[PDB]
Amino acid sequence: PVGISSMVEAMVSRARIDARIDFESGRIKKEEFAEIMKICSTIEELRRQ
Amino acid sequence: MEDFVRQCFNPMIVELAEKAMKEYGEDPKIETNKFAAICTHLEVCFMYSDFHFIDERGESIIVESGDPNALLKHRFEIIEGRDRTMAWTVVNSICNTTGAEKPKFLPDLYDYKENRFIEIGVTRREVHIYYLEKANKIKSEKTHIHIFPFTGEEMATKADYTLDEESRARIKTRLFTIRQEMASRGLWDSFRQSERGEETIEERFEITGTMRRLADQSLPPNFSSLENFRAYVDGFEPNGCIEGKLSQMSKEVNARIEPFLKTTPRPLRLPDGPPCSQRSKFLLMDALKLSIEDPSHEGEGIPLYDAIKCMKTFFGWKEPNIIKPHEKGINPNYLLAWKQVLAELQDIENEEKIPKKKNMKKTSQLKWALGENMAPEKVDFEDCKDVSDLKQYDSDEPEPRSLASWIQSEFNKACELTDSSWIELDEIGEDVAPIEHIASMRRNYFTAEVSHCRATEYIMKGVYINTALLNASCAAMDDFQLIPMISKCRTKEGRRKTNLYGFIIKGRSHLRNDTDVVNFVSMEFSLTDPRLEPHKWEKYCVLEIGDMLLRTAIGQVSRPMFLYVRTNGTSKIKMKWGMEMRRCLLQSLQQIESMIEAESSVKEKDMTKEFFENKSETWPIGESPKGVEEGSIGKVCRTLLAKSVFNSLYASPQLEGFSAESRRLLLIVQALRDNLEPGTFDLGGLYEAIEECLINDPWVLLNASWFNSFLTHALR
Amino acid sequence: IFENSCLETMEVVQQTRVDKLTQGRQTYDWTLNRNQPAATALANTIEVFRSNDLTANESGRLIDFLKDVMESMDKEEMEITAH
Amino acid sequence: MERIKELRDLMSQSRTREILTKTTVDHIAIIKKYTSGRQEKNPALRMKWMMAMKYPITADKRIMEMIPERNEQGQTLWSKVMVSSLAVTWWNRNGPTTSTVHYPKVYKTYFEKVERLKHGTFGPVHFRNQVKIRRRVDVNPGHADLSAKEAQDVIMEVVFPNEVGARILTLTITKEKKEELQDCKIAPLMVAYMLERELVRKTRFLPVAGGTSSVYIEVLHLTQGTCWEQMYTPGGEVRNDDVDQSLIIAARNIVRRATVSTDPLASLLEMCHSTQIGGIRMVDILRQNPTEEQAVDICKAAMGLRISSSFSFGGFTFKRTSGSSVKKEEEVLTGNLQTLKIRVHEGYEEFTMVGRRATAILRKATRRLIQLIVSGRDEQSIAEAIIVAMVFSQEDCMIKAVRGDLNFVNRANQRLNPMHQLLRHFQKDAKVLFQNWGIEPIDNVMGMIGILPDMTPSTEMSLRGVRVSKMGVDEYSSTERVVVSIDRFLRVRDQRGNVLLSPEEVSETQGTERLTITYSSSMMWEINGPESVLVNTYQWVIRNWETVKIQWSQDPTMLYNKMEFEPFQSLIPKAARGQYSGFVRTLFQQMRDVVGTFDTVQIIKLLPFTAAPPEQSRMQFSSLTVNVRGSGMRILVRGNSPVFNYNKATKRLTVLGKDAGALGFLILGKEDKRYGPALSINELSNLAKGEKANVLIGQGDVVLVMKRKRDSSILTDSQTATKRIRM
């Protein structure tokens, strides 16, 4: 692979785009989506320290 | 980096890098990071300059194509792409024309619309630190600073990004793609160099204390510090001290060539003393089969209950009569173990269920036979202090076991043919014209000439015994098990026949590692009386076990049956060398196939079928009556097979050493036979190494007598 | 011709990361004072270096691992964690 | 949520948070190689034991609704996810039959070999002590000769478009692959792996016994042996043995043409930047194709690429094996009373020369030749090799063998250095040297026979130092990549001032194109068809018509004097030329006078005739003539003509049937929450009228993106630098 950014800065963004794409036209429940994104924000708040 | 740099850039920037490096003589071959940084800076300035003109009014515009149609002012004057003094001249000219105070530091571009000094910086580190460093170095003057990293960020002064967005974004994009390209090639080496402000340094690898202290201590005994050593090696005199060193060295230190004539080779010496016993893991010829002709379809034919019928097929099991003891030790434990074997063989149907394997009881006689109870104290030395019998283990080197005459007879009987097939050589696809037909008529003829060989039976025997032993040692990890010495074959009429050679009792199999030793006891049937040649069976104890029928042209003879028993050890690797003993076939075929090519290399039509198909072709293989005995092909084929077989099963390091030292002498003798006047260096030393690799292995000793008689019959 | 060989060697020392330390036979780890596989000794060494400030190997280039080795020889006390 | 919870509970332990923070994506390959590496416990024995045991297989849980627990005979093959082997064979017989049998479109790399064996007619096995030829050949057959990186980028695009690399430049292989297997995905990772196996080149060094292509190599184990060989013709051909030939011929003819140019270097550079080969630019092919040949090596050197340190001479490529070189200029007398100063190499040297049809080894002291061991195919090949060898001997023995004056010049009538002069003099006739060389008696050892001046093998006598080898001399393609310094005259001096490559050993038998190639830079069309010259001239006019639009207005004399018409001017007859020039120029003047009443189509129709020096002769014209391949064709001046036919509504210009003309994104900075949330690489709705978007790149970060307005070409904008620099 080819990339400078940290592991988390790539994985979190990829997960958010994935949730977006398989929610909008894909198949996922909005509550599962909201929990996914809250967990992602928890990851972000943990990686900031 | 360098080759990639020449890949992803124009040659004009290459020449500019040449000129800018010649300004200080900066050799590109070293400052490769500086090479990349300078080419980067130049192309950055260029793509900042392209398509930037100033309209007639007080503003600047862009163009799609390149042409000076009454418009030439580039809105920006390039500074870096020119020589040192000429660039300073241009800077002075434009400063005096515009009245702007020149800065002492050399810029890279000049603005016309804003009339400001823009200098560009490309680095790897955080852009904030680079901007602050340039500001702390260049301050108090109106000089616009613009820094571009490889990541694509952008930092100007007072949010005055002195351009449109897109024309600059193409520059950021080029930077990012260049970064990706150097990353895919793994050329991020320039990361730690631009982390200095000074963007040219390479990886400094100093040698400080605790390391240099050994380096200056690492020099030959005429120097003090390794820096003086490096200077002394760099400035060196290839003057030719070699001639003087030769003139100083003694004339005795020399490789005085000693000749090798056909009267020099002396026959090898041989050990003298006790006759060679047998350490073979299992029996070669003396063991007897239990012919059943039972086609059980081999539905994973259970090896124990395929053996109970072998036992059911014999009558005349006399009282166990001890004949030949171990010559030292409590022997009755062997026959007690044997009767216990029979008991557990008859105590099965009473446990309400047939067990697929019978775990022998932890019996005291058998515990002694396996030495499980035979264990010393595991005591730390700090406790057993000042002990009377605390002397070391003996660990004595073995005694030279002299040669006996039986190993040659066993080898002779090993090469003979039988009435069973012993092989399932798997099928092969259709054979095409050129070689596949030739490969066939080689391999199939060799098969049919060695298929029914007794050495095949030996190989399969080792295979099955060691296979069952390991496959149980995995699952019998805590308790004793019984090991049937099973072989298989096919009748001359073509019916799957199962043979049984004996029984083996396994000790504990707590096998954590591969060299872990496991003791085992072997009891093999025979019709060969130990009372004939006693010294052969030093490790064996024999039991007169009964009488069997032996049919002849006139009735039966009723010869006695004997049971040979020994104790030995093995391990996991010891077994797997033996589960793959079929290799001895390939080694045979190829060391046949080699001769099919080398000696037939000199022919337009290779001598392959004429190797076979001509019985008039004879091979000297024997000399019993003081005369060379010639034989046919298949005898030689099975002979080489048996050679690799015995070498595999009797594998001993003395054989390895002897083979190594015999290759040399044989090659020299073969050269002399061709009359190519060879010589030696230390003939007595070679004999010394040979005698040093000859102690007790009977297979080695038979090879040695073979070699000596060969040199005597080598017409030398 | 030695300088040509040295140029190929410089190219190597420029691109070579730490991975080429793993493709090989058994090694010796002093952390347990015994022969162990490659990645075992490498990971234990990296983690005991991270136990202290010596962390240049995080760049990934093997030469930085060598600088870490040198600085390790430069330090007097080296706390060995046991597990 | 299926995936992230492992990351979270992994971020729970701090010693894992640290590593997930510090190490970056560029380093993931350096970290996946951190494994215990102990479960290598005799895979044979563990496999056998696990096969004895029931249920060694791990399936998914979805077998319940696909296969049963009890087979057709009540056999147990499940657990409670483990599965025994028999389930495979049962499913192998009767299950969901599928028409995915279209498989042989991703595995074509194998079925190509299968088909090669199908009609792969054989031959007899003539056993012989086969000699190993130390050659270097490719391993993959029929892969269009593509490098690893430029192929794996296309791979990554076709298999994982939502994470493509940052290479976005705007080869239809992308379209063909995305179309033929769009929804018929098979096994992603295996698909990409096997495509990398199919397309990526790899070429290395092997001893062969006559096998040229890759197809003769994948069947090497059938052909080659210890003392045997089997001729086997797979009945086919690949690209890697006949794609590079077209570039070879094109660069050879380009060098053949560049000599007459004033500065051959610049004309060659413009040619190489413009010329297209197989739809791919020649410059990239030179940067990526590892073919070694004088023309190709020189074209690569013009772009500063490393090549082998060769003393190429006599059509033979040389390699430094041992020994040093010293200048030692020296005087020489000819056989016709002529003095010549020549560079007699001092010191000892030992070389191995490789040729087109032969090879040889040589040892050389100061004007001394020793141990010349040659091996070739034809009598003519060994003749040429021995000739160039004796030329290189520099002994006075060959000095005596000079007959006649020495005047051999370039195709531009340019004096060649003496070595090449001697070579070209002897190449046609050199029989006189052997009779005056000296003979020595040999011993017929090691299958090395002698050769006589009458080109006849002999047993016990030969030339001094000569040896005739059997079935080829040991080649060695040494790997060196050294810089060079080419001059303005297409001469090659790497570092020592030694003449390496020169356009005197470049030509052989006629060139026969396999790949369709197209030149577009400079004249370079006197070789291509005359119709090609017409259509190329008009197409070039249409191409750069934008600049002619005003370059025809101001300083039109220079535009008329554009030397790109010089090939076109030699086609129109040399008689009525200046009259045509004057007529067309006064017609353009009339159009300039009565503005507005002028048609652009007729302007293009009548422009390219201006290159002549006009002669204001008192007559006009309505028809113009061109001599092509003997026959003369006409073009009118109003409306369409058989050559100039411009359709009214089509707006495409036609010239002799042939059609002729008609009349990614960027990074803005890091992620900023202004322009919404992140996106994947799919803009079917976003490519409306120029949007702004933040998007993940590859496996990296979020980058901003705007549209483009410029084109970012490789054209003379880089050369425009030489007008702002060195002004």
Next chain:
Amino acid sequence: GDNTKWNENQNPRMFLAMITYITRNQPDWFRNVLSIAPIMFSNKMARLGKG
């Protein structure tokens, strides 16, 4: 021929010397890096292990 007990005779300092001469007038840190292994072998300890 062969060279009996060859491997036990090669002194690391001779390797240091040949490496240094190979690095004639080469950059300093390069000489420093390729000189590590022979210097480490100049003071090297042999482990016994168990006994």
